[PDB]
Amino acid sequence: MAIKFENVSYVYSPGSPLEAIGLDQLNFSLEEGKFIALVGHTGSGKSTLMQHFNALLKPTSGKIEIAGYTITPETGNKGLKDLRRKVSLAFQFSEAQLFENTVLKDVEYGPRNFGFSEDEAREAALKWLKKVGLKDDLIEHSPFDLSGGQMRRVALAGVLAYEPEIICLDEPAAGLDPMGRLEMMQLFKDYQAAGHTVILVTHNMDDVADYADDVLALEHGRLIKHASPKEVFKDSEWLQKHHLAEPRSARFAAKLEAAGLKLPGQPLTMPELADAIKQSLK
Amino acid sequence: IGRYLPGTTFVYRVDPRAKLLTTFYFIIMIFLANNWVSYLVISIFGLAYVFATGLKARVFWDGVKPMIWMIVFTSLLQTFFMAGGKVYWHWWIFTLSSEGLINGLYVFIRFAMIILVSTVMTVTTKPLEIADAMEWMLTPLKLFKVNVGMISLVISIALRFVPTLFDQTVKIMNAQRSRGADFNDGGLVKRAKSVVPMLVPLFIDSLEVALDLSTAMESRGYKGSEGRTRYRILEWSKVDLIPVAYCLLLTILMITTRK
Amino acid sequence: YQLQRLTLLALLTAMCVVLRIFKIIDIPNVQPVTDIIMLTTLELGAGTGILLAILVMVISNIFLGFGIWTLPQIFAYAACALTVALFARWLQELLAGFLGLEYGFFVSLGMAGWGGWAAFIAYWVSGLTFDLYHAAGNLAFYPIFYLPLVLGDRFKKKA
Amino acid sequence: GSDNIISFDHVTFTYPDSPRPALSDLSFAIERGSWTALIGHNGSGKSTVSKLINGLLAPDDLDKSSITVDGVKLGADTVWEVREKVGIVFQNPDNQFVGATVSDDVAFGLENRAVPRPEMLKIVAQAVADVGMADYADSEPSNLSGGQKQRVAIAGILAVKPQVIILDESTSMLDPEGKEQILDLVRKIKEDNNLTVISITHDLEEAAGADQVLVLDDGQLLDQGKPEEIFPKVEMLKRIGLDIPFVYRLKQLLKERGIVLPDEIDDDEKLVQSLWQLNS
Known part of the structure; x- marks a missing residue:
């Protein structure tokens, strides 16, 4: 429950330390019960580094020191149904892993393949059909006659139905409308705080403000800084030189400070951007 | 894409339609095999290009490596000096002399040349240009049950998706490792339901996406033949008379002993 | 009027090309051809020349590149679709007239004889290959065909 | 004037007829020249509004409540000549x-x-x-x-030189700063070519940027008015189930945090100049 890289590199085709592309220099140290980010601009390291953590790719210069297990470059295929019961990355539009004829058998596919009978995995396939946001109709049925928010709850329960130590998330409420992505994400504060190392691949700036505790930023194939929301968007040359952006709760102080208001700070959040339009218009 | 390569910047090898007229001539040509102006010629006058591609010598073991019990296995059934089966004409089978060694080694050229002139089909051309030459000779099939303009959509579109598929056919295999998974596990009459997490979402994206691909085709102007102009075309240049003589010189350099 | 039946044979036939390409990372192809799947889903309520222009839309459109998959080099395109020109015009005798006389009696019996002579030589060096085609290629009609393949196969089309 | 009458229209899917109608109501109209958002809960039958308009859908009838333009109608043997009046980008451009x-x-x-x-x-x-x-x-x-x-796909319309652009759930799978690059590529065409781009459910700048807004549940409409008339109805919108733009999601975090400027303030250039009117 303390995930570090020192140091990881992955280029598809051979050679080291050459050259730069893909995932370069990749070094940090995370924490157990935190809300991690994988941010930046598209084309740097998020999807391309997400897939390493749980060994669905293995480095080419160093090591993935992780929750329990450990990924090396020479790694194999032994001891992966506890690893992949400790880490369960969630990819972009994961309502695409769907194949069963009951839902429950997709959410039973997480606990099974990881070691549980049908009738215990009926208590993870039912707990994760109920504690993931679906009603007395949809705590079991056919797995397609649903919507993509309800199938992204099969998608995100079938991958959560073992309670993994770690749950990475490649924008896993992507495509969802106002209310769908504002229920799956607070969900991930109750089951992050369970002691659970929540990572998040995205570019929603106004979600690191909202949901994060620390961050992890990249560019162009080289890690620019492992951070935490306030050491991040102070200098807006780090959003201009380094390709990134800010939240519209943070993007607006400068739209209000640039009138003479000069808000108290760079607050970045919505309930706390507006305590500063107050403590300064006094 | 797709092996092998439009590598930069090799000699002509252009007009992906005239290297189809060529590659099939050079099999519809190297029929009628009797004499020496044919083999020593075709084996080097039909190779004078294939080499001119110059691409490294270790490529053709891709075309020969993992099955060698055809070539000097079944051409040896040709090694009877006279009609290597079911000879049948006339009266001597095996020889090591001026005439049983040629006929039976004379196929180590006339047959292993059309696998080179064909390699250098899938070697020099763009798979979106190997495709347009298949269709060039094609759509003039408007004599018969025509049906020709619906297969020339498919080809831009069959190939529009060989990457979109393999690029997602795959992510379903890595997305089905938050859930599982069982992939390599043998068993003849035991295990084959390894490929289920993947083929079950894959048939959606044949069947569903072809509904949501066909309704934006339809709802632009696709009333669909008749009408229907087109955009994907290429020109010929003064350059591309090279394979048009390649096969004309080899008309006379074919008969010039039969004369 | 009732089209959108072709614009699928661009996208069904992108997935029999991209199924014998194996999704080559973890390669769920073990041993010989595993594309015939959706290709009885086409008998089951689709068409006759739908079955034929899906393999000549493969053993052309994945002949690039390299090409020939089973055997060494350049042949066997729609002598592989004489197996499929007679398809529909059980699971047990779909790989057993196939196994026995249909499948390879056109593929190499063409290739390994042209003057009018013997053919068994290279033809069934592939003996056990052609009886290893059908280990789970019979047992492939059990999992994926009857329920998954041809049920949904209906709900999309016929609109 | 007005460019489309969708009268008391309705859609019913094949088997879901007596269980679940798709509209049954709506009873709307759009303005010939405006940027129209359509918002509503994600079953409200609204992502189909744009398939009725080019004959992809002959859902229920064509005579009792048909669709019409001020040139042509849906749908006769012309229904194809109403894919020359209209043009639609779609959800996932990968497929089309x-x-x-x-x-x-x-x-x-x-x-x-x-x-x-x-x-x-x-x-x-x-x-x-x-x-x-x-x-x-x-x-x-x-x-x-x-x-x-x-962007390859908003060209396809300009190549065919329409009268009407339409967004059928477009830029939802797209990155937060993927959509605001493409959704200004379309307001330019509303300047460069003064066409009429008919939008579907998203939020602030797919909703409160727009010149109109329609909120629908479960298939039926209230509040056809400008996004500014609509979203102020923040509660029988939380039972409709929606959000409001961060324009309006701060004025309420300012009416709760002290700053109680009047409740018609929509521009991002109304939360900037109306809020140094208060430092005094």
């Missing part, structure tokens, strides 16, 4: 990408219409250049970055 270039798919819509290829080289360049796509000239689309297939 017919042609492994950029210029092939922009000029598949002049293909089908007898329009000469020399005049298609040109209609298609400054349709794929008006979107920045000259330097990504013939890029295959299974390679293309998901952002750019939605």
